[PDB]
Amino acid sequence: APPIMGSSVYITVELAIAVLAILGNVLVCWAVWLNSNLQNVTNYFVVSLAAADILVGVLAIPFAITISTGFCAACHGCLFIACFVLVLAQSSIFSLLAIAIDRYIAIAIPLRYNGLVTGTRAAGIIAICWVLSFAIGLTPMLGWNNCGQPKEGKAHSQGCGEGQVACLFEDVVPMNYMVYFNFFACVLVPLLLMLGVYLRIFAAARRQLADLEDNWETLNDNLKVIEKADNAAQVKDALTKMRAAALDAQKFRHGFDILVGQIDDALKLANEGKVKEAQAAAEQLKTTRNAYIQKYLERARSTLQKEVHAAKSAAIIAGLFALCWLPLHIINCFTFFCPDCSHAPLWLMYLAIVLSHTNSVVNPFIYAYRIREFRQTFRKIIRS
Numbered sequence: 001a002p003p004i005m006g007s008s009v010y011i012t013v014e015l016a017i018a019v020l021a022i023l024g025n026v027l028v029c030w031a032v033w034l035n036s037n038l039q040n041v042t043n044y045f046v047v048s049l050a051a052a053d054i055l056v057g058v059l060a061i062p063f064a065i066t067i068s069t070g071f072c073a074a075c076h077g078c079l080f081i082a083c084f085v086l087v088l089a090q091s092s093i094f095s096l097l098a099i100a101i102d103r104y105i106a107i108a109i110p111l112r113y114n115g116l117v118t119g120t121r122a123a124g125i126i127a128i129c130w131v132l133s134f135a136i137g138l139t140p141m142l143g144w145n146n147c148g149q150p151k152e153g154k155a156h157s158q159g160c161g162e163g164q165v166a167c168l169f170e171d172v173v174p175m176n177y178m179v180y181f182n183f184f185a186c187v188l189v190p191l192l193l194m195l196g197v198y199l200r201i202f203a204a205a206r207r208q209l210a211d212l213e214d215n216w217e218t219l220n221d222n223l224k225v226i227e228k229a230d231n232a233a234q235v236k237d238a239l240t241k242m243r244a245a246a247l248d249a250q251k252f253r254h255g256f257d258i259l260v261g262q263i264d265d266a267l268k269l270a271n272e273g274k275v276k277e278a279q280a281a282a283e284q285l286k287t288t289r290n291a292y293i294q295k296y297l298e299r300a301r302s303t304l305q306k307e308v309h310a311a312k313s314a315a316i317i318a319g320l321f322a323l324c325w326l327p328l329h330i331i332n333c334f335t336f337f338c339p340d341c342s343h344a345p346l347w348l349m350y351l352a353i354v355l356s357h358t359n360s361v362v363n364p365f366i367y368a369y370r371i372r373e374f375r376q377t378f379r380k381i382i383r384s
């Protein structure tokens with residue numbers, strides 16, 4: 001069958017993906033530009049991610065369409081159109097890893113996040129990561145390429161000129177570069193690092209949820225212990241456990257000032273052997289607990305849960321990157337590691353290529369379904 005028929009389907013699908021990648025990610029960038037509630041360090045990496053995806057639509061997809069034709073080209077110019085998508089994929093990987101680390105810093109050390117993670121430092125990191133992405137993605141242009149060994153029969157068959165090759169991805173980009181350097185070192189290792197970071201994020205959240213519930217349970221149990229206490233020493237033991245626990249949750253302010261002060265009141269009576277007076281003073285903690293501590297409780301729990309939700313949203317983005325890019329990388333592994341295996345058929349290569357490009361469509365939908373500030377800003381933009 002004429003190659004232009006299957007090529008037409010592949011090209012049409014690529015162009016449809018390009019249109020969607022541009023539109024959705026321009027909308028992401030416009031939302032962040034317009035909404036100050038979306039202007040934080042996390043979303044600067046989101047914007048860097050959306051910029052890479054815009055460039056997939058504007059440049060990498062036109063480059064991929066071009067390189068599927070095998071047109072005659074100078075080999076190094078062919079290398080650049082082959083490899084520019086690797087720059088954009090690498091930049092996405094750095095942004096995804098930055099977002100994960102950012103969310104880890106926010107949940108592990110929230111008291112120093114604002115002083116540690118600033119807009120100026122984030123912009124500097126983004127710039128450095130773009131430079132590194134060009135270095136990593138265009139490494140074949142530094143000499144790790146197949147231009148020294150052109151396929152002359154294919155070039156002659158296409159009527160190519162002297163110094164030109166039929167411009168095809170696997171003819172110019174070495175597969176050991178793609179498998180060992182690009183896939184294993186530059187993609188697989190950072191994704192596994194991201195997985196580790198997300199594991200620590202969710203473990204940290206669960207531990208802090210446990211601690212909040214243990215501190216809450218300790219407060220209510222020791223009050224009950226005091227009520228059924230007999231000597232002053234038992235009242236003293238329970239209040240001491242409450243006081244240390246009260247200060248531990250103290251790391252709203254008036255409520256803990258009342259709580260500690262009321263614990264100290266009962267402790268002073270307990271040390272004087274006045275059990276009934278200490279027990280009666282301790283019953284007032286219940287008034288403080290209802291009016292302050294429980295509210296100062298579900299708010300921290302609510303905040304942690306919002307952080308879990310935001311961490312899950314970021315993790316879905318990273319996971320969709322892995323799902324969309326892994327088939328093409330896995331095919332490369334088969335090409336490289338199994339020379340006795342027939343090459344993956346051309347329709348599957350096209351499917352794996354277009355799947356990798358669909359990843360540049362999906363992030364705006366994840367933000368729309370999972371982040372209210374984005375969803376609400378999207379709606380206002382579309383209406384206006």
Ligand SMILES: CC(C)CCC[C@@H](C)[C@H]1CC[C@H]2[C@@H]3CC=C4C[C@@H](O)CC[C@]4(C)[C@H]3CC[C@]12C
Nearest residue numbers: 059072073074075076077078079080081164167
């Ligand atoms: C900022 C944006 C708009 C710049 C876009 C520039 C792009 C389209 C340019 C820059 C370098 C160019 C390549 C440089 C060299 C060659 C080799 C030649 O034998 C065929 C064309 C080819 C393969 C060019 C294709 C077009 C190209 C990729």
Ligand SMILES: CC(C)CCC[C@@H](C)[C@H]1CC[C@H]2[C@@H]3CC=C4C[C@@H](O)CC[C@]4(C)[C@H]3CC[C@]12C
Nearest residue numbers: 322323326327328330331334341342343344345
């Ligand atoms: C969802 C993601 C993470 C995994 C997807 C796995 C895909 C990419 C795997 C599963 C089965 C695989 C195929 C199994 C057998 C062959 C025949 C061989 O001659 C060429 C490779 C080829 C054609 C493989 C290509 C890659 C393949 C299609």
Ligand SMILES: CC(C)CCC[C@@H](C)[C@H]1CC[C@H]2[C@@H]3CC=C4C[C@@H](O)CC[C@]4(C)[C@H]3CC[C@]12C
Nearest residue numbers: 188326329330331333334335336337338339341
């Ligand atoms: C997703 C993370 C955890 C792992 C990535 C999966 C990669 C590294 C694995 C999954 C399946 C593997 C392939 C399974 C089968 C074969 C055929 C054999 O003749 C050569 C190796 C080769 C081609 C393997 C190479 C590595 C491979 C592609």
Ligand SMILES: CCn1c(=O)c2c(nc(/C=C/c3ccc(O)c(OC)c3)n2C)n(CC)c1=O
Nearest residue numbers: 064067068069085169170178328332346349353
């Ligand atoms: C992630 C980087 N990357 C790749 O690894 C890749 C690729 N394209 C191919 C193979 C194409 C092909 C193979 C055999 C053919 O006969 C053919 O005919 C046109 C085409 N690979 C391996 N691109 C898309 C340009 C790509 O972005």
Ligand SMILES: CCCCCCCC/C=C/CCCCCCCC(=O)O
Nearest residue numbers: 058059062063066067071072073081
């Ligand atoms: C903002 C615009 C960005 C670039 C627009 C689209 C880019 C298209 C990329 C160029 C591939 C086509 C050039 C190769 C064909 C001519 C070479 C030949 O005929 O031998």
Ligand SMILES: CCCCCCCC/C=C/CCCCCCCC(=O)O
Nearest residue numbers: 120121122124125127128131132135
């Ligand atoms: C081919 C290059 C390979 C080595 C790349 C070295 C990294 C390039 C660094 C320059 C980036 C310029 C921006 C520096 C400002 C960062 C300050 C900050 O972190 O806030």
Ligand SMILES: CCCCCCCC/C=C/CCCCCCCC(=O)O
Nearest residue numbers: 326327330334338339340341342343
């Ligand atoms: C992360 C998920 C990874 C999924 C890996 C899927 C690959 C498993 C299937 C491997 C079977 C490949 C064997 C095909 C040999 C071809 C025989 C031949 O053509 O001579």
Ligand SMILES: CCCCCCCC/C=C\CCCCCCCC(=O)O
Nearest residue numbers: 029030032033039047051052054055
């Ligand atoms: C030559 C290619 C250069 C153009 C790349 C195209 C993609 C860039 C997209 C725009 C970056 C968004 C900048 C402002 C968005 C939010 C950032 C902010 O205001 O804090």
Ligand SMILES: CCCCCCCC/C=C\CCCCCCCC(=O)O
Nearest residue numbers: 057058059062065066069070071072
């Ligand atoms: C905002 C602009 C974004 C890009 C617009 C341009 C769209 C270009 C579409 C595909 C370019 C394919 C070029 C065809 C390669 C030449 C084929 C050949 O010479 O044999």
Ligand SMILES: CCCCCCCC/C=C\CCCCCCCC(=O)O
Nearest residue numbers: 073074075076077078079080081141
């Ligand atoms: C937005 C500013 C961008 C600045 C220009 C970036 C493009 C660089 C242009 C030339 C270097 C391209 C490398 C491939 C062309 C030479 C290879 C060859 O012909 O054999």
Ligand SMILES: CCCCCCCC/C=C\CCCCCCCC(=O)O
Nearest residue numbers: 124128131132133134135136137139
């Ligand atoms: C192919 C990969 C090559 C990598 C080479 C290593 C170079 C990268 C080095 C790290 C960049 C850090 C930039 C810090 C300097 C300016 C920041 C500052 O003002 O404090």
Ligand code: NA
Nearest residue numbers: 053092359360
């Ligand atoms: Na991306």
